[PDB]
Structures are given as C-alpha cells and as structure tokens.
Structure 1
Amino acid sequence: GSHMTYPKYLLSPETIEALRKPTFDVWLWEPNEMLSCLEHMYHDLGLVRDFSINPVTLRRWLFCVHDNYRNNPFHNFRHCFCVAQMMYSMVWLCSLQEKFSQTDILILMTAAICHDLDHPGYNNTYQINARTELAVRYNDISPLENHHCAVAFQILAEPECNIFSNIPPDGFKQIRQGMITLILATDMARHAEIMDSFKEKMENFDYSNEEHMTLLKMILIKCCDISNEVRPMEVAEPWVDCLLEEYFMQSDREKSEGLPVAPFMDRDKVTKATAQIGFIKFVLIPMFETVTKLFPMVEEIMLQPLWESRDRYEELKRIDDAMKELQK
C-alpha cells in the first residue's frame, strides 16, 4: 500500500513484518528476495551493529553462501532460508534475546544459514556405504556436516566475504567453535543422543550453565532444520515432495549400485502420508514438547500445527490405502 512501486529486492513493510513469524510463505520469493530477507535479519537482530559487520560484506557473504548451495530438490538454498527464517521466528517467539548473548544469536543465525552448504543430494549413509571421497576424507564421521562447516569457513576466509573481520580473535574463536558444534549437531544419526543429553539437563535447567546452553542451542538448530511441518499446510506440503524426490534418487542409486537401502527411502515402501505421520509423531512432536517446557508459548504456535498436520496425514493415508485396495 505504498505511493509507488519498488523493486522486489526492496522488501515491503508487510514482508518485513511477516518475516518475523513461522507463517511466512517461503515459496513466494526468488533467491535475491530471500537474500534481502536474510540481510534484514542481521540488521534487525542488531548483529551488524554489535559485531561491526560491514554492510556490503554482509551482502557479498550472503551471495557467496547462496552460490555454494547446490540445486538439490530439498537440500538447497530455499531450505537454508527456511531454517534461518524459523530461527529468526524463534528469537521473537521465545524472547531469546533475554536469555542469549548477541554472540549466541550470531552463532545460531550463521550456523542456520551455513548448515547445509554444498550438499551433494545423497546422505551420510550413501557416502559411507559407497566409500566416497567425502566419507574417506572424514573417516565416516558426520561427513556431510563436517563438509558443510568446512565450506562455511572457506567462504568466511575470503576477505570480501568475511563478516567477522571486525571481531577480535577471541570472539572469532568463540563464534567458530559454537558454529562447528551447531552444524555438527544437525547430523540426524545423533538425534537420540542429543535429545537424551538435553533431557538430562532439563531435570534442572540452568541458563547460566554453559553446557546447558550449548545443548539448548543444538536443540534449537535441530528444531529449525526439521521444522517444515510446523508451517501452514500450504507452505509445508510442497516440501514433502522435495524430500521424497531426494530420497528416491538416492535409494534408486543404492539398488543399482548394490548398496543397502533404508526402508524409509524406498519408493516401494514409502508415501507422503507414511513418511510424515511417523516423523511428526515420533520425532517432531516429542522434540517440540521438550522445548515447550522452557518456552510455553511454543505449544500454541508450533505444536498445534503439528497435531493438525498429523491428523490430516492420517486421513490422507486412509484414502491412499483405499486407493491401493483398487490396484491389485
């Protein structure tokens, strides 16, 4: 509702406001618009101010991150934007600036943005089983996540992209360690371990305990990474097809190459509805349930849409199953 028309990469006041909430429609925007959103987040969170980030370096860095995301069906730049935009939403929803230092917020946001850089479109189990150059490089230890992190810091070592160039060395070392911990924590193999450790701390949680706070930040980046189904159905739904497209590409390849296949990626065994019912019930709901014990406001904003998505997928499954009753 402005008196003239602006270029798309100039975010409207309504977009800037919408960006603060998990209802934001991530599909609406092209890459250069998404880049403008991410830029706005760094200014709006006070990170440009508190870390003396050169504003032009911020943009060059974002452009370079974008260029180093691959065009996978799921693990692409739009996914990175989702994860970061959910993290941003969490900052406001949970009032994280009351609990976390600016350095922690910087770690959270930058890790979120960087956490899937240069993803090859085939997961760690493929890397390991196929004995790829990556699996060999990283000795079968979270090869993809180690790689994402190493690319992150290769980008940040280019002077014209170094958004940390005005932070003193000790600050840099603190941010580097935090980002490594958080990006490595996104390896889903470690999900049960990290949830257990967190739940231990949750027996008597202490915001001034640095170990407690490291685990909270790992849980937060983990929430955001797998958060799609928290979004409105019409935003969330198209992601599932993207996920399955990547899964099926891998499992087709594994069958062909003579490698082991996960039943959860097998296009013979797997459907949209079956994929999501399990993940929502047994991974997402329980995770957000534990978060909701620190941040009660999470139940209404995030657990509700998950209960809704679960129920809807259970309905879809009934129809899918009937439809297969017709095809023998």
Structure 2
Amino acid sequence: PTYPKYLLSPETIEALRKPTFDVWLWEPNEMLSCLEHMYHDLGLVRDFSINPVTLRRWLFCVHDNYRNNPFHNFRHCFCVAQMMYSMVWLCSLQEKFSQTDILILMTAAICHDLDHPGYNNTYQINARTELAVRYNDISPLENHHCAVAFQILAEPECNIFSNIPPDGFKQIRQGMITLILATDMARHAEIMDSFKEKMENFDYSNEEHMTLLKMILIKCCDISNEVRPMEVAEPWVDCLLEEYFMQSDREKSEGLPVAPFMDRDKVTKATAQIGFIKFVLIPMFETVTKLFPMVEEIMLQPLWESRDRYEELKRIDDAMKELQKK
C-alpha cells in the first residue's frame, strides 16, 4: 500500500545525503524520522549502543524545546543537522574523524539553538535580561542552548548516551560545549583567524587542529542556507528578516540601540545577503575547500551564483529607487 509519511521512502533516504535536499517539503514527524535515520546510518546507534527507543524520545524532546520563532526554530535545527550529514558524505569525514567526533558534530548541530527566544545576544545584554544576568554577558544564548541540551540528556528517558562510559561522556560533553559555544557570531573573526593560523600547516593528528576544524564545520552548517538551491534558500531570508525586524521594532519601542543591519527601514533582502555571502560565507568555505577540494563545486558554486543574483537584484532595487526620485 501507501506507507505513512513517517516511513521514509528510499528516494528520500538517498536525497537526504545531499545538500540539495528540500527542507521545506517535510513536516516535523518526517524531519524527526530523517534525523533518526542519520544516527542509524552513520553507525552511531551501533557504536555507542544507543537505545533506538531512547533516540526517538530524545528527538521528540529536542523538538519540543525549539520555539516557534520565524527563523530560529526546529526546521533551522533540521537544516543545520542535515547539512552536517551532507558534509560527512561529501568530505568523507568518517575517514578523518573518529565516531565520537561524528557524534559530537551531529548532536551539537541538532542542539545548538535549543530554546532560542528570537532575540539575539545584543538584545539580551542591552536589555539586561535574566539570561544576560545569568551568564554575565558571555555568549548568553549559546550558553543557554548548551545548558538546555544537557538538561534534556540528563532525563533518563532522553539520555541517548546512557550506555557510554563516563570517560566517553565527558569527552562528548566537552566537545559539544565547544561546538555550540563556537556558533556565537560575535566570535566569527576570532575563530576564523585561529583556523587560518593552523591551516598554514594542518595536522589531522593534532587535537587542537581538529577542534578548530570541527568548530568551523558547525559554523559552516549553521549559516549554510545560501549553499542550498535558490528555491530552498530564498524563503529563509524572509524568515530571518521577520525575526530580526521583530527585535529592532522592540528595541525602538524600549529605547534600546538598533543595529542598522537589522533595521526594518534600512534593510532589503539583497542588502541582508550580499556582504554576508561575500565576506562571511565565501571566505569561510574557501578555507574549508583547501582541505576538502570537492566543496568548491558543491558549495562554493551555489554561493557564487547567489552572490551574483543578489548583487543584480540590488542594482535593480537601486535603479527603481533612483527612478522614483529623478
């Protein structure tokens, strides 16, 4: 017969390995089954004796702890994990990384924006929120995401690590913390600089080199929307701006500072994306390409096309503005 949606077809299973996967086609249950499959498919269930039922419960609790923000929601979580999954296959990461490292990457990706409130660190700090006070202005959101991740994993019915020895858990915990804290965009230039420094002579034996690579990998997946095919990427920009404009409106309403790049009166879809693609995305992916040359064709290529497309869209926008004042 026709099988229910939460039973994934073999065509989906195949497409899921690839950064072209249409993240918009699927509802929560289907995405949850996708994530479940990734853990089996990567041999993490096997190698860490993950109780398959616990794995399902864990993913449900994770889902429940993402909020319905326009951008930072469960689907974003899914995108980031699915891109990590894609990159494992694209870059043959199982040749370079231990199974513990693959587990860290994947689990960090799923958990990295848990309970995001839809207002970024600058709002937290300037508004002196409970979170900013709790974390002393030090990456309040990312600290909170990581805290919630391990609150969940401490509930015995969600503890996918229950059959891992304590030493393994400590290693996994520390790695996940490093990775989730690395997603604070305030630290972007710092982290890129450290990574570029190691790239002068990269060493897969060197644990510090590998820690930085993993930080770069999760950072890549986190902001990877523009790597996806245009029709998959475009809607995310509207989601982003909806969330960002919600924050700038609120900051105006409360007399707090407003960042120009988030201002509803100054931002267009094109200006939101151009500099971000050219100066954040492209250079980051360029450095990764040096270790994984296959990344150029699969991920740099769509970024170049998206850059050109948004640059053209800005010319059109500018000409249209000029026309109504000439």
TM-score scaled by structure 1?
0.98
Q: CA deviation at 1:254?
A: 0.7
Q: Aligned partners of 2:175, 2:69: CA distance in 1, in Å?
A: 27
Q: Aligned partners of 1:49, 1:155: CA distance in 2, in Å?
A: 22
**Residues 153-199 of structure 1: CA deviation (Å, up to 9, x unaligned):** 00000000000000000000000000000000000000000000000
Q: Which residue of 1 aligns with 2:212?
A: 215
**What is the aligned-residue identity percentage?**
100
**Residues 229-259 of structure 1: CA deviation (Å, up to 9, x unaligned):** 0000000000000000011000111111111
Q: Aligned partners of 1:46, 1:250: CA distance in 2, in Å?
A: 41
Q: Aligned partners of 1:320, 1:34: CA distance in 2, in Å?
A: 36
Q: CA deviation at 1:323?
A: 2.4
Q: Aligned partners of 1:202, 1:268: CA distance in 2, in Å?
A: 41
Q: Aligned partners of 1:66, 1:324: CA distance in 2, in Å?
A: 43
Q: Aligned partners of 1:8, 1:72: CA distance in 2, in Å?
A: 25
Q: CA deviation at 1:319?
A: 1.6
Per the alignment, in what secondary structure is the counterpart of residue 53 of structure 1? Answer: coil
Q: CA deviation at 1:315?
A: 1.1
Q: Aligned partners of 1:278, 1:216: CA distance in 2, in Å?
A: 24
Q: Aligned partners of 2:49, 2:317: CA distance in 1, in Å?
A: 54
Q: How many pairs does the alignment contain? A: 324
**Residues 101-158 of structure 1: CA deviation (Å, up to 9, x unaligned):** 0000000000000000000000000000000000000000000000000000000000
Residue of structure 2 aligned with 1:11, choices 3, 8, 22: 8
Q: Aligned partners of 1:304, 1:240: CA distance in 2, in Å?
A: 19
**Residues 75-112 of structure 1: CA deviation (Å, up to 9, x unaligned):** 00000000000000000000000000000000000000
Q: Aligned partners of 2:195, 2:266: CA distance in 1, in Å?
A: 33
Q: Aligned partners of 1:231, 1:207: CA distance in 2, in Å?
A: 28
Q: Aligned partners of 2:252, 2:322: CA distance in 1, in Å?
A: 27
Per the alignment, in what secondary structure is the counterpart of residue 323 of structure 2? Answer: coil
Q: CA deviation at 1:320?
A: 1.4
Q: Which residue of 1 aligns with 2:50?
A: 53
For structure 2, the 5+ residue unaligned runs are none
Q: CA deviation at 1:268?
A: 1.4
Q: CA deviation at 1:322?
A: 2.3
Q: Aligned partners of 1:292, 1:261: CA distance in 2, in Å?
A: 36
Q: Aligned partners of 1:64, 1:145: CA distance in 2, in Å?
A: 19
Q: CA deviation at 1:326?
A: 4.1
**Residues 187-217 of structure 1: CA deviation (Å, up to 9, x unaligned):** 0000000000000000100000000000000
Pick which of 316-325 and 158-167 moved more.
Answer: 316-325
Per the alignment, in what secondary structure is the counterpart of residue 112 of structure 1? Answer: helix
Per the alignment, in what secondary structure is the counterpart of residue 192 of structure 2? Answer: helix
What value does the CA root-mean-square deviation take over the aligned residues? Answer: 0.7
